[PDB]
């Protein structure tokens, strides 16, 4: 994909449609983070008639571009579903009918625009993906009775918690590369996510890349699942940042990688493999830090969060940080098999007793949503760096 391949005539033709579609509103059916299952209803107008949004489609995996705000769509979903239990965790997508997959709704920007951040765009892997590999797998991977609707967790991931805190739209380009992902879409670099995003952004209206907050975390699935070499992940990561900044990005959040060798799946690994993967993470994290320093010197607005250090603290002494267990999967999974993401799994007795909000790990690989929230809160804290970005205020 290349944004340069899109012509002015193509942009005009695409934007000249003004069709309509419906909104699928998803929600968690159970009343805590222990239960990942979800269901949906069509969004409704206040009188119960079906809600529609006007706009146009584009696909190079179709996105719907509308002038209806994300806040209004969310409100319609909340009013329609009327969930009164905790952890409703509502999300929504465009869909013409029940056979459609979950398409992202993009709210076009207005002509009148200053310098405030007006959306978050996320790049990365299974620590950030909110539904891309899930759509590519026709909703079979990860299994949606046990992993929360296309997220590799029991709920929202860190980018979603940041977006919620700042009252911003989140548009996700991250692609899960966890074990078993190979079967739905060949491994691609994070630079290919940047290229794809820029092609979709060419169809947006009044889009100013300097008003996007970009998030980038990558490399964990590459080292753990694809045995990639550090020099190749460095090249992919550097290329992505060159392309993103060349396209006009100014505001980027970077993070170091957690030491994933502390995850339960490495109970089934050799010490040699633990040492090999760990050394790659250590080396790659220094490259992330050097890239951040470089882009700061070049004049960009960069934050760098040391997720590696936060995660070392959580796995070393979970109780100091509000967790009870950082060594075991919450799910009753007693092996490290790619196939396990295809099946449903129950909580262990111990996780059910203490609750999944007290565990660091959901399955054998990924953090629980309580950890994702903990990461987001650390990143949002005063002095942690986000003050350098131009956020809107909201009196509510």
Applying CB under 5 A, the residues found at the interface with Cl ion are 362-363, 365-366
Using DSSP's 3-state secondary structure scheme, residue 323 falls into coil
Exposed / middle / buried, residue 380 (Cβ in 10 Å: 0-12, 13-18, 19+): middle
Count of beta carbons in the 10 Å neighbourhood of residue 42: 17
Q: Measured at CB, which residue is nearest to Cl ion?
A: 363
Between 179 and 244, CB nearer to Cl ion: 179
- Smallest distance from Cl ion to CB 47, Å: 42
The answer to whether 327 and 307 are in contact (CB under 8 A) is: no
- Smallest distance from Cl ion to CB 350, Å: 17
Between 191 and 366, CB nearer to Cl ion: 366
Count of beta carbons in the 10 Å neighbourhood of residue 160: 23
* 271: Cβ contacts below 8 Å, ≥ 6 apart: none
What are the start-end ranges of the E strands in 38-166? 38-42, 52-58, 63-66, 91-95, 105-107, 119-123
Between 103 and 151, CB nearer to Cl ion: 151
- Smallest distance from Cl ion to CB 152, Å: 6
- Smallest distance from Cl ion to CB 362, Å: 5
Between 177 and 363, CB nearer to Cl ion: 363
- Smallest distance from Cl ion to CB 335, Å: 13
Secondary structure of 332-388 in the HEC alphabet? Answer: CCCCCCHHHHHCCCCECHHHHHHCHHHEEECCCCCECHHHHHHHHHHHHCCCCCHHH
CA distance 203 to 200: 6
Closest C-alpha to 73, from 55, 58, 53, 56: 53
Q: How far apart are the first and last CA of the chain?
A: 41
Between 74 and 354, CB nearer to Cl ion: 354
Between 1 and 342, CB nearer to Cl ion: 342
- Smallest distance from Cl ion to CB 279, Å: 23
- Smallest distance from Cl ion to CB 63, Å: 28
Count of beta carbons in the 10 Å neighbourhood of residue 216: 24
- Smallest distance from Cl ion to CB 248, Å: 36
Between 252 and 257, CB nearer to Cl ion: 257
Between 24 and 372, CB nearer to Cl ion: 372
């Amino acid at each position: 994909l290349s944004p340069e391949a899109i012509t002015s005539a193509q942009v005009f033709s695409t934007q000249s449609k003004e069709t309509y579609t419906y909104v699928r509103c998803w929600y968690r059916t159970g009343n805590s983070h222990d239960e990942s299952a979800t269901d949906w209803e069509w969004a409704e107008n206040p009188d119960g008639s079906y809600f529609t949004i006007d706009g146009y489609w584009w696909s190079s995996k179709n996105m719907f571009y509308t002038n209806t705000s994300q806040n209004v769509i969310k409100q319609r979903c909340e009013e329609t579903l009327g969930v009164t239990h905790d952890a409703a965790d509502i999300t929504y997508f465009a869909a013409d009918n029940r056979w459609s997959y979950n398409h992202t709704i993009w709210t076009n920007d207005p002509v009148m625009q200053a310098d405030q951040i007006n959306k978050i765009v996320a790049f990365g892997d299974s620590l950030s993906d909110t539904g891309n590999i899930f759509n590519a797998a026709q909703w079979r991977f990860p299994n949606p009775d046990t992993w929360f609707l296309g997220h590799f967790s029991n709920g929202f991931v860190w980018t979603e918690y940041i977006a919620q805190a700042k009252k911003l739209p989140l548009y996700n380009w991250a692609v899960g590369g966890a074990a078993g992902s190979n079967q739905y879409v060949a491994l691609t670099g994070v630079k290919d996510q940047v290229l794809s995003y820029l092609t979709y952004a060419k169809m947006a209206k009044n889009y100013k890349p300097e008003n996007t907050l970009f998030t980038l975390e990558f490399g964990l699935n590459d080292f753990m699942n694809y045995n990639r070499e550090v020099v190749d992940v460095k090249t992919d990561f550097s290329t992505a940042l060159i392309k993103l900044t060349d396209a006009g990005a100014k505001n980027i959040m970077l993070m170091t990688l957690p030491d994933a060798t502390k995850a339960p799946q490495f109970k089934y690994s050799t010490q040699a493999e633990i040492e090999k993967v760990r050394a790659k993470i250590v080396e790659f994290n220094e490259f992330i830090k050097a890239q951040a320093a470089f882009y700061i010197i070049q004049g960009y607005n960069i934050t760098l969060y040391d997720t590696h250090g936060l995660f070392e603290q959580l796995t070393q002494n979970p109780q100091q940080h509000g967790f009870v267990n950082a060594s075991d999967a919450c799910l009753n999974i007693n092996r490290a098999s790619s196939a396990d993401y295809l099946y449903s799994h129950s909580l262990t007795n111990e996780c059910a007793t203490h609750s999944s909000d007290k565990y660091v790990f959901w399955g054998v690989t990924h953090p629980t949503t309580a950890v994702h929230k903990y990461i987001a809160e650390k990143m949002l804290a005063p002095g942690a760096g986000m003050q350098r970005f131009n956020f809107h205020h909201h009196h509510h």
